[PDB]
């Protein structure tokens, strides 16, 4: 890279990170989608 440096981009990490397994910085998977079924919310005022 001292001779042919990489193509600069806005989004490329400026600070490289080593493997983070086993530390507080480790990756934790989760579902990236939102809730699909909305439940009905009962009324707050009484009425029976």
């Amino acid at each position: 890279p001292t001779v042919k440096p990489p193509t600069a981009r806005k989004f490329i990490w400026t600070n490289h990170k080593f493997n983070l397994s086993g530390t507080p910085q480790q990756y934790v998977p989760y579902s990236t989608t939102r809730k699909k079924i909305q439940e009905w919310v009962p009324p707050s005022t009484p009425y029976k």
Partner: protein, 289 residues
């Protein structure tokens, strides 16, 4: 309910049981069976551990991916207790040694720690709280172990009134300190099987009638300590001052308290399971009606 904790599936490893349980003292004899049963049906289990991560590796295969979560905690640190319980729906306390150490005596593990868990759990909003005491808990007891249990039982019931308190006799099982205790060596004992105790705890989590109640988990039969010990050596083809006090304490009889049969658990005789425990060490024992 909350949409994420509605039960789904057929009650297996990949199912969703709806239980989010924090189990303190999960790295011991009772905790492994409790955690195993919780993960059998697909519960989220939080395991606060004081020990090495290496000593908690036997719990990893007990739950599908992501279902067993491990956190560090210190019994004296309230924040570390708060972190482990604020997302749970039930908190289970199985903390306790059978001996005192220079750092923790029986008051620390049977009064101070259970009360700290109960106080943090109540403040954090946990609805269900299960606390394990002892059948022979008594402030008039010769054993400092059993005297501490009685005090901690009182403080738990006053700090978390809805807590379900369970009072088992000595528990026999593969890793127990009871049948294995004898095999490595006036009183009437009524020991109970480890799996029965585990089912009782699980059934208490699922039963609304168990909230606020105290149960006594005892085996189907009462034996004379001498007769039982003779059986152990026959099956196996063959310590502290306080420990001896407990082993010599006749098992209380508490008819007023509910028991395993109330939680739908049929107690298991020691004779069906004695070989299981004692085969590794290689005629019945008179029962008291």
């Amino acid at each position: 309910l909350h949409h994420a904790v509605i039960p789904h599936g057929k009650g297996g490893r990949s199912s969703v049981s709806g239980i989010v349980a924090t189990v303190f003292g999960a790295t011991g004899f009772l905790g492994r069976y409790v955690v195993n049963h919780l993960g059998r049906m697909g519960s989220q289990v939080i395991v606060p551990h004081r020990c090495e991560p290496y000593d908690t590796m036997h719990l990893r295969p007990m739950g599908d991916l992501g279902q067993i979560i491990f956190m560090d905690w210190n019994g004296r640190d309230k924040d570390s207790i708060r972190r482990a319980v604020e997302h749970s729906s039930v908190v289970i306390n199985l903390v306790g040694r059978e001996w005192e150490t220079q750092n923790f005596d029986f008051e620390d593990v049977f009064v101070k720690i259970p009360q700290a868990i109960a106080q943090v759990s109540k403040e954090a909003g946990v609805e269900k709280f299960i606390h394990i005491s002892h059948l022979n808990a008594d402030i008039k007891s010769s054993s400092k172990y059993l005297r501490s249990k009685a005090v901690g039982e009182k403080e738990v019931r006053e700090t978390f009134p809805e807590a379900t308190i369970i009072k088992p006799a000595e528990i026999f099982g593969r890793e127990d300190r009871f049948l294995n205790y004898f095999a490595n060596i006036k009183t009437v004992k009524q020991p109970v099987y480890i799996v029965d105790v585990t089912k009782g705890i699980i059934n208490a989590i699922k039963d609304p009638d168990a909230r606020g109640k105290t149960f006594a988990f005892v085996g189907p039969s009462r034996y004379l300590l001498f007769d039982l010990v003779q059986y152990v050596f026959a099956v196996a083809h063959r310590t502290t001052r306080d420990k001896v006090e407990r082993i010599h304490t006749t098992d209380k009889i508490l008819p007023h308290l509910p028991g395993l049969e109330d939680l739908g658990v049929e107690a298991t005789p020691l004779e069906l399971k004695a070989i299981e425990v004692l085969r590794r060490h290689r005629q019945p024992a008179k029962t008291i009606p």
